[PDB]
Amino acid sequence: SMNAMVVNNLTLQIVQGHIEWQTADVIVNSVNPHDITVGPVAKSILQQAGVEMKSEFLATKAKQQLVLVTKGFNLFCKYIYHVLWHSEFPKPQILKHAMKECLEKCIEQNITSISFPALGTGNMEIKKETAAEILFDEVLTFAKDHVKHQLTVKFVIFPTDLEIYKAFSSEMAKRSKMLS
Incomplete structure (x- = not known):
C-alpha cells in the first residue's frame, strides 16, 4: 500500500519502525505532562534519549502549553517536541492544536525533517x-498555508501495530487521490 506522497514542497511518509531509533531534525514525543515515564512512546524515547533528557524536560517545565521543546540528547535528532496531553481538554482538540503547533515550530526553527x-x-x-x-x-x-517550506513529515508506526498502519495508509491513499 501507499507509504509516501509529495504535495508541493512537503513529503509525507509512513514508516513501520521505532520512533526512538529515528534520525531526523526533530522527533516528537507523546507524554502525560506530569509524568513522562509512562506510555509506550514516552518510555521508549526516554530510555533511548537518557536521563539528561528528563532533567531538561523537568527544568524547562518548571520555568513555564501543548508542546515543550528539549534537545535530543542521545537521540539522533536536534530537538524533541514533547506533546503534552493535559487531562482537562478533549483529546481530539489537543491532537489538532498540537499538530499545528509542531508544524509551525518547524518553520520557526528551520526544520527540514520531523518524525x-x-x-x-x-x-x-x-x-x-x-x-x-x-x-x-x-x-x-x-x-497549503506555507507552500515554500520544504519538509519531510514521517509517521512512524510500531511494527506490530498493523491496524494503525492500515488506517494511516488508507488515509494517505485517500488524500493522494483527492490531490491527483
Whole structure:
C-alpha cells in the first residue's frame, strides 16, 4: 500500500519502525505532562534519549502549553517536541492544536525533517481513523498555508501495530487521490 506522497514542497511518509531509533531534525514525543515515564512512546524515547533528557524536560517545565521543546540528547535528532496531553481538554482538540503547533515550530526553527509516532492513537477517546484524519488534515493545511517550506513529515508506526498502519495508509491513499 501507499507509504509516501509529495504535495508541493512537503513529503509525507509512513514508516513501520521505532520512533526512538529515528534520525531526523526533530522527533516528537507523546507524554502525560506530569509524568513522562509512562506510555509506550514516552518510555521508549526516554530510555533511548537518557536521563539528561528528563532533567531538561523537568527544568524547562518548571520555568513555564501543548508542546515543550528539549534537545535530543542521545537521540539522533536536534530537538524533541514533547506533546503534552493535559487531562482537562478533549483529546481530539489537543491532537489538532498540537499538530499545528509542531508544524509551525518547524518553520520557526528551520526544520527540514520531523518524525512523529502514531500521535493520538492508543487511547480510548480517539478512533485510529479519526487520529489519521486529524493528522493528515493538519499536515495538508500546513502545506497549503506555507507552500515554500520544504519538509519531510514521517509517521512512524510500531511494527506490530498493523491496524494503525492500515488506517494511516488508507488515509494517505485517500488524500493522494483527492490531490491527483
